[PDB]
Amino acid sequence: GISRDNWHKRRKTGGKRKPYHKKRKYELGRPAANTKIGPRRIHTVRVRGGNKKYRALRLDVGNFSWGSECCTRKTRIIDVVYNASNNELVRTKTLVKNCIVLIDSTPYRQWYESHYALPLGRKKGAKLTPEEEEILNKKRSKKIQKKYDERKKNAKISSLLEEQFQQGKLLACIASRPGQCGRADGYVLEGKELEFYLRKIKARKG
Amino acid sequence: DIQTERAYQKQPTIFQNKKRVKLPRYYKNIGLGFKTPKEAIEGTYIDKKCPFTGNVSIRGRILSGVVTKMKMQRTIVIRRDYLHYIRKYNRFEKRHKNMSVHLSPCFRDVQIGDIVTVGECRPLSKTVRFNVLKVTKAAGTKK
Amino acid sequence: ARGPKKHLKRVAAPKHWMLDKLTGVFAPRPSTGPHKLRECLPLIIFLRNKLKYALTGDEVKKICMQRFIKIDGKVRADITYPAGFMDVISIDKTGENFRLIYDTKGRFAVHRITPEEAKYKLCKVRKIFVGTKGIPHLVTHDARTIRYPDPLIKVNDTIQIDLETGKITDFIKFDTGNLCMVTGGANLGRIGVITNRERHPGSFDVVHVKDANGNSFATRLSNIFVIGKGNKPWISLPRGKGIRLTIAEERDKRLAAKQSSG
RNA sequence: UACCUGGUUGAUCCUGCCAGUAGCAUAUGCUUGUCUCAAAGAUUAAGCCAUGCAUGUCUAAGUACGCACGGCCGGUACAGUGAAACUGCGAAUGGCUCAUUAAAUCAGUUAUGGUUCCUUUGGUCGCUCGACUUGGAUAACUGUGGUAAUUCUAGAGCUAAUACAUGCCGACGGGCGCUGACCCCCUUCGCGGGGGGGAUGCGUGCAUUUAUCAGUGGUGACUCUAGAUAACCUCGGGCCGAUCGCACGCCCGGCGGCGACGACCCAUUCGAACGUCUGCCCUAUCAACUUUCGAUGGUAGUCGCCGUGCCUACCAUGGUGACCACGGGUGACGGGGAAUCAGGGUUCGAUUCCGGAGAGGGAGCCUGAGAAACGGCUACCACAUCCAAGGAAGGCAGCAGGCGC
RNA sequence: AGCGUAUAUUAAAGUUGCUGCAGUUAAAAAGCUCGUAGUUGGAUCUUGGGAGCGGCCGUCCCCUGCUCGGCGCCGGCCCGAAGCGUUUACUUUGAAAAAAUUAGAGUGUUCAAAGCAGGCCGCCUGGAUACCGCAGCUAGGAAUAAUGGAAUAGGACCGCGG
């Protein structure tokens, strides 16, 4: 059907090839997955050798990684902002590999607070009134507190990250082919990558 | 200077967001006694298809032509000359076969007429299957 | 071809089988197994053509379905099972044991061995490997995977394995000054002492071998088998002892034995 | 065996062709006693086909309550042979023809460190810390039917599994990694300090997807293989045996060997696939060709078993050519080879071996490890069979054979 | 026990000519010079030495350096190994090259075409060998023919500041 072959298109010299055989199967080709954002929907494609290949047609969750301290959590994709290849893949917000998405910052914040015993986001004059957040931020023995005061030293977050946390949504880049593995796994944008992409989103936006 | 294309250009193996308080570079000697040249280690360019600072393995043939054209993007046309031997008349005939070959921005200045050594790699584009590995400046070319 | 091929024509059959033309159209396409299609000896060929125990492929079928023939200490009820190099074929009811090692010419000789020698075989290691728990792995020339080997054994050595346990006893390192039988190319069956190994990065490394009588010949490294340390083979050899004398010498020896018979 | 003879002239010496001369292989004419080998609807029509055959298959070892045959004491299920049917496998090989196809096919040479692989052979399969055997359908069978018709099948009642589903218990007590009550110790009179034990909780195996750290074995070279940490796990769902046959055993209702079958992963065998370098007949009354609907490159995707303009989007202006590109022709499938030969050579190679392509012409797909399959299905174009006129069924370039040529 | 005919094709055909044809008059030299590809291009750079043995003669061997062991000898001399050494054609060697056919060794298919069999009073034996252009791989040789090095000295080597 959808042919994936070299013999259908002109030689290096601009001379036409006359096809010496009809379409073979291994010269295969199938329609594009076109993965949207919605409730989990995955169809299975049986491929050469009797192996499987999962078509994610809708996805909500995704395994994203805060790379600077090896904090990976399953979060909830909310929307797409910028795609490098094509900008109709933004309009009809398709999930493809290496597209910029926004994710829920809540599992990263929860880990950050429970690891450093310091607040992240939570704007000045934050009423922490359930006060089991204050349990996670206070009430230790002696030597355990020494370990936690030792560690809070190197919890200096990049201001670019700290804004996104306080807004409540982080930028991430999809590192897995979602149309072939049925997964929207990626990494949270940081440093020079983040400054590059934040310029690109603002510039395009206007 | 770099990162002209819409997607962020990085050597995808090296991680550049290690918390602290220069950028590192990934490269390799590509075997067969080829000196991984100085620009590979001390450049700040990005290339998928550089045999030194990229993901291509050199294996199979090692051929050599003369640089003919340098008018396409990170690619050049070399011209390979040989004598085909007709059998009936106990004489030769001068033939040629010019191939599109991938030139890394590693080799900073090559001039049309320079001698190139090329190593076979996987198919890089429609017609490109070879990589420039060392350049030998044409007869003299000092001034 | 729309899939794997199952018929092998008699003219396409490997030449070392010495199959006659006017018998049929086909030869026995060897069933998949440890050795390659090209370089094996199918059990029907060895049993019917070489030994002359059977006359037809149906007679060989009638033998092999009584569990008589044992290849490498296991019963093989497949008449086109590929029996290849170094393989040990023990028939119990007759009380006979054969090791398939090459004649001095490019074919398999029918070399009888003793009950005590038909208990092991030499395997050329093909690739060393680490598993899924830093457990080292061997792969041999006859498709055997041996895990937890000796930590010195490397990619071109020879190992002596036992045909009950399938475990490594002793091994011969691939060195200069070690006996090697040549198991591929023009010099097929030539025994000699390794003189040199010539390294070519990216190409096939050629290895120089010295025969007993000062005959020097090269072969690609792949087609060599270290069968002994020094001049001492760890197996028994056929009559000839892998020299491959010239055609003028073979003539002289033939008509010497002829005229002596008279 | 490196060969020449007749014919322009009144006669001569030349150029030059015509005609002889010997193979070869298609047809043909006349003649044809023995014996051994042996080509044979290729050229024209890859034109059209009546008829019949050419692909099926069971072991002790998946499922037998068909009396269809059957051994005796049967009352503790099945003795034993075995049609049918379900299941499993094969039907992708073999055979036929040469219409296509001119760097295509194909031949030698190398690459997969850029992939998939039924079967075989060998590894793995209490590595995981949380039931002395489960479930509801269906066939053969029994019976009730349809239309003119075919290997069409609707309805009812009965029953199986290695079909289709669902699932423990084990080994199993812990181990490792975080978490961390709390605890005791020695020093500073004292804070602080140094190391020790450790409750509760969460996580764990291989494969799978992603991110980070370290540098047991290997390569000419890995972004290899192993190892470490933080998560994931497709409900169209990876594994971690609800299986079958012979031998029957070893102590107080205790107690295990040969095999068959099955399986995620690994290597191996059989391959396949896409690439590397060099190589092809005639043609200039074919000199310029290719491209904003892919032509040559760059970046990021999509798709595919994978590498790639294969295809999307945005960029760049490139690629090939007198060393013959682009176009056209072939009574062109390529090669191993064949005829003829002093030495060079010329011509042939549909034809039994290897490789390719096709099944009337194109196109699209199901199933499977492998098919764009045609002794598979679905359309349209050409042809064409049977019609109770509503419908049903086609594919000889398989083996025979018929018309046409 | 075969011979005649028709047609495609090979030798004859030195009548397609690379080996190997012709071009004043038999068929044939552009009217004439210029000119890029193509083809072809003068001479010149290692001669000459050490020693062996047969009858002044004939052939055999001896001609660039910079880290790990024993023939050992006393950090050294020697021999070896893993590396290095203007490119290219040429030539010789080695590897790798499916069978069948062809050439070709053995063998009384009754001979022969073939066939891969057979032979000796259980035994003894074959099933060889060559050939396979061109391109790719590998190791010797260095005549012949291309190609490179110092000339704005940004030359080689040797040392000192760095």
UniProtKB/Swiss-Prot annotation, chain A:
The alphabetized list of GO BP terms reads: translation
Name the source organism.
Answer: Oryctolagus cuniculus (Rabbit)
InterPro entries noted in UniProt: Ribosomal_eS8, Ribosomal_eS8_CS, Ribosomal_protein_eS8_euk, Ribosomal_Se8/biogenesis_NSA2
Task: Give the sites modified to Phosphoserine.
Answer: S159
State the oligomer form and interacting partners: Component of the small ribosomal subunit. Identified in a IGF2BP1-dependent mRNP granule complex containing untranslated mRNAs. Part of the small subunit (SSU) processome, composed of more than 70 proteins and the RNA chaperone small nucleolar RNA (snoRNA) U3.
Q: Specify whether Lipoprotein is a keyword of the entry.
A: yes
Region labeled Disordered — which residues?
A: 1-26
Its protein name is Small ribosomal subunit protein eS8
Where in or outside the cell is it found?
Cytoplasm; Membrane; Nucleus, Nucleolus
**CDD domains xref list:** Ribosomal_S8e_like
Curated annotation (Swiss-Prot), chain B:
Q: Could you name the domain of life of the organism this protein comes from?
A: Eukaryota
Q: Where in the cell is it found?
A: Cytoplasm; Nucleus, Nucleolus
Q: Which residues carry this modification: Omega-N-methylarginine?
A: R59
Q: Which residues carry this modification: N6-acetyllysine?
A: K28, K35, K48
Cite the GO molecular-function annotations of the record. rRNA binding; structural constituent of ribosome
**Chain residues carrying a lipid of type S-palmitoyl cysteine:** C50
Q: GO cellular-component terms in the record?
A: cytosolic ribosome; cytosolic small ribosomal subunit; nucleolus
Q: State the UniProt keywords alphabetically.
A: Acetylation, Citrullination, Cytoplasm, Lipoprotein, Methylation, Nucleus, Palmitate, Phosphoprotein, Ribonucleoprotein, Ribosomal protein, RNA-binding, rRNA-binding
One Gene Ontology term from the biological process aspect of the record: translation
List residues, modification Citrulline.
R20
Asked whether the UniProt record includes Nucleotide-binding among its keywords, one would answer no
Q: Which residues carry this modification: Phosphoserine?
A: S57, S100
Indicate yes or no for the key word Metal-binding: no
Q: What main location does UniProt list? A: cytoplasm
Q: Cross-referenced InterPro entries, in alphabetical order?
A: NA-bd_OB-fold (IPR012340), Ribosomal_uS17 (IPR000266), Ribosomal_uS17_arc/euk (IPR028333), Ribosomal_uS17_CS (IPR019979), Ribosomal_uS17_N (IPR032440)
As for family, the record states:
Belongs to the universal ribosomal protein uS17 family.
Instruction: Say what the protein does.
Output: Component of the small ribosomal subunit. The ribosome is a large ribonucleoprotein complex responsible for the synthesis of proteins in the cell. Part of the small subunit (SSU) processome, first precursor of the small eukaryotic ribosomal subunit. During the assembly of the SSU processome in the nucleolus, many ribosome biogenesis factors, an RNA chaperone and ribosomal proteins associate with the nascent pre-rRNA and work in concert to generate RNA folding, modifications, rearrangements and cleavage as well as targeted degradation of pre-ribosomal RNA by the RNA exosome.
Subunit info?
Answer: Component of the small ribosomal subunit. Part of the small subunit (SSU) processome, composed of more than 70 proteins and the RNA chaperone small nucleolar RNA (snoRNA) U3.
Q: Fetch the NCBIfam families from UniProt.
A: PRK08572.1, uS17_arch
Q: What protein name does the entry list?
A: Small ribosomal subunit protein uS17
Lineage, opening ranks: Eukaryota, Metazoa, Chordata, Craniata, Vertebrata
From Swiss-Prot, chain C:
Q: What biological processes does GO assign it?
A: translation
Q: Which residues form the S4 RNA-binding domain?
A: 41-103
Residues modified to N6-acetyllysine? K232
Domain of life according to the entry: Eukaryota
**Sorted alphabetically, which CDD domains does this protein's record hold?**
KOW_RPS4, S4
Report the locations given in the UniProt record.
Cytoplasm; Nucleus, Nucleolus
Which InterPro entries does the record match to this protein? Answer: KOW, Rib_uL2_dom2, Ribosomal_eS4, Ribosomal_eS4_C, Ribosomal_eS4_central_region, Ribosomal_eS4_central_sf, Ribosomal_eS4_KOW, Ribosomal_eS4_N
Give the range the annotation lists for the signal sequence. Answer: none
Q: Which UniProt keywords apply?
A: Acetylation, Cytoplasm, Isopeptide bond, Nucleus, Ribonucleoprotein, Ribosomal protein, RNA-binding, rRNA-binding, Ubl conjugation
- Protein's UniProt keywords contain Acetylation: yes
Is the keyword Secreted in the record?
Answer: no
GO molecular function terms listed in the Swiss-Prot or TrEMBL record: rRNA binding; structural constituent of ribosome
GO terms for CC? cytosolic ribosome; cytosolic small ribosomal subunit; nucleolus
Where is the crosslink of kind Glycyl lysine isopeptide (Lys-Gly) (interchain with G-Cter in SUMO2)? K229
Give the similarity note.
Belongs to the eukaryotic ribosomal protein eS4 family.
Q: What's the stated role of this polypeptide? A: Component of the small ribosomal subunit. The ribosome is a large ribonucleoprotein complex responsible for the synthesis of proteins in the cell. Part of the small subunit (SSU) processome, first precursor of the small eukaryotic ribosomal subunit. During the assembly of the SSU processome in the nucleolus, many ribosome biogenesis factors, an RNA chaperone and ribosomal proteins associate with the nascent pre-rRNA and work in concert to generate RNA folding, modifications, rearrangements and cleavage as well as targeted degradation of pre-ribosomal RNA by the RNA exosome.
Its quaternary organisation is: Component of the small ribosomal subunit. Part of the small subunit (SSU) processome, composed of more than 70 proteins and the RNA chaperone small nucleolar RNA (snoRNA) U3. Identified in a IGF2BP1-dependent mRNP granule complex containing untranslated mRNAs.
Name of protein? Small ribosomal subunit protein eS4
Q: Which organism is it from?
A: Oryctolagus cuniculus (Rabbit)
